[PDB]
Amino acid sequence: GTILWDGRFNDMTSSADLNKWSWGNQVGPYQYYIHGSSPVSAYVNLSPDYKNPADTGSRQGAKITLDNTAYWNGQNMRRTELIPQTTAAINQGKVYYHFSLMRKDINAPATTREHQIAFFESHFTELKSGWLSGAPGISDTLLRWCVGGQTQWSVEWAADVWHNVAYEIDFAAGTVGFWHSTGSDPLTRKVAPVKTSTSSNGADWHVGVLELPRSGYPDSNEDFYWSGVYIESGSLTTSVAGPGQPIPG
Template identity: 45%
Template sequence: MRSLAWLVSIPMVAEAGEVLWSGFFNASATIADFVKGSFSNEVGDWQWYIHGPAATEKYLGLSADNKNPADTSDEQGIRITIDGTSFWNGQDMERSEIIPQTNADLGSGHLFYHFSLKTEEANAPNASFEHQIAFFEVTTPLPKISKRPIANKDTHHRAISQSSNTAPQVGRREQTTPSAGNWYNFAYDIDFDMKTVGLWASNGCDKLTQVVSAVNASTATDSADWHIGELRLPKGGLDAAPEDWFWSGIFVEKAPITAAIAGPA
């Protein structure tokens, strides 16, 4: 186990890799932009994919205060909230998730899937429940973050778990105890051609470093199944209290990696 200290969409050429898709939010972006789009009417870089029946503003919030200060590619970060209304089509899981809306191929070659994540003391995640975060909803094992209670202690995060809803867990895992208010930066290292996955991570404004080297895995995506947001499993109980998660610096690039948290801009 390695402990971390916690944890426009046009192709552009970065100092490192070529950005295939970005979910950056500029200063003029609003939550109304999410409402404009639909399956049949694509608008912008994101699709408001799975959520509860309440107003979008209840689950999503854009603000400069919601981003990692070290991220200069975004002008705003996004708050994604789950609560007791976040049930989708009769499911018993609380879910609030956005996915990339793009025609770019995000499933071939050697790619890095970047994002930064934090929580706060207010509306903190409930440590009694398992969460799936920044995951691929596919039947092949790709990276995700799982947040689970361990031995009745504070919540731990597995920064890489090569698993899916149907595949057994294999490979290496990175675990840490999160601290409210701290930003944790990740890049899923996926080589779709070589069939390997790995993980880069850092804390705050520190550059990404490799924490899991490439391990063999079955890799596939339809370029629209990377879920940014939260899925919380009930595990025999319910809690209507809101949980706020803050996201920043979300983009996908070709290798080599952009290690600076400032991003490719």
């Protein structure tokens, strides 16, 4: 395999480095602009305590937060998102998009509201959580993998569990497959490639979270933990510790 882009934050000392990126000076691994009126430390913080402990390939993980000010461009949905800053061909051919995600019981995401996570701008694929449609119910506590808006896989989203994911995207065939594991276990393919319109970017993968409003549910702080975010081509690294690291097991 070969890493096309590395979003593991390994060259950053803290999230303050995100402030180096600007439209006039697009440096670093991430474009940082889809966020609210507060400083970056209100929305993104890095720490070794915020990553999947089995991922020795990531020095620090990132706590991404939605708070009362997490509104971008006058929209009514809360968002805190980072987009890959790269010249690599991450949207052509077969490409694997990696990331690990975890929530805790403190500042847990609201199960009463829909969340769109690690999504592309056209939403051809993404993860979702929370109450989506219909009556509220047992499905609201699920973490789901969607293709074209349709759920293709889901699991109960438990606190403190690290979910490791890789989207297997064939931009030429217009298909997306789903690889997943929890904790230290190696990724396995849980859903074979599904067809959909994969029309892609300039730069359009949103590493972060978007939360829709829902009548009667006030904003409360919500924290999402991320680590091991990167994009590779040719050969999928199934080890959660990433390429060039000893396999955890």
